[PDB]
Amino acid sequence: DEAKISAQSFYQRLLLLNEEAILSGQDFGVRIDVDTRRLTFLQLTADKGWQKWQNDKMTNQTTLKEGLQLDFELGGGAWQKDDRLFNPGSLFDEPAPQLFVLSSGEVTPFTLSIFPKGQEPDEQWRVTAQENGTLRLLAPGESD
Template sequence: MKRIDQPMKISKPRKNHTGFTLIELMLVALLMGLVASAVLFTVDSSAPQKALKRQAKKMAALTEIALDQAVMTGRDYGMVVELGSYRFVELVEQRWQPLADDLLVEQQLKRAQLLLSVDGFPWSPDQLDFSSNALFSEREADLEQDQKEQKHIPQLLILSSGELTPFTVEWRFNESSEQMLTELQQRYRLILKADTLGMIEVKELGHD
């Protein structure tokens, strides 16, 4: 019987896997951070403009709700527009006072600035007088009540007849927000426009 010699099996030396080095891990982390930043910038580069547009559309929606309520309830409302806020008021017993409504509450705007125009001109105190004294000139004067009412006198009327003071509000970012925005974002503008019949639209300035 012949003897068959089996070839010797030579085992290959095992490689020692020591894992990633610290430098490699740091490079991976750096690359992941750069990719995440790029994606975040791409996704959120228009986030401030979208947020501003949502606020402007909310103002339009609340104004429409106020007009509908005025018609349905037979009450006359108004709107007070300031640089960083707006609120609704109500005419009660020939006096303007805050509107007590859970939905139509005062809106404080942290990043937005509002510029009101009426009849195509920037609003000024001597442009329109919707104080109760002007609306009800036959009423007896009451200095104490006049002073209390002063901060609630609206620039815009929202009437139970379904009529609305025609106006435009330019929406832009305020100065404190501009420090965190790009130059393009700083120039971003929105126009909210309303006519006498309560037709309200919001559009980007320079866009149809």
């Protein structure tokens, strides 16, 4: 529910980014930082490479509220987050995105899972870009 809202947020942002790429002919991307529970929305630029997308449609970085976690898998791969409660180097207060959102409309196949702390990522609230191109929001327990 806090997880649901967060999943909807990401789904809305991803669809808008996909739309922007198609409309503008520019390439975009999403960087997932599992240790800081952050999602960053990036634009590829010739002069500066990947940068946070400065825009008048949506914020370009979101961080999950306390009590929620996230994890991700790329295509058919394993979940990316390790089992540590915290990364002792990350505690202290652009890197390229793992998800490319291209102007052709193609999106890197992936699954992002958002969930309460204490739980595993499997079959949680999920947003996925399927091998066939479809973007989907999945509820907990929902297949595929």
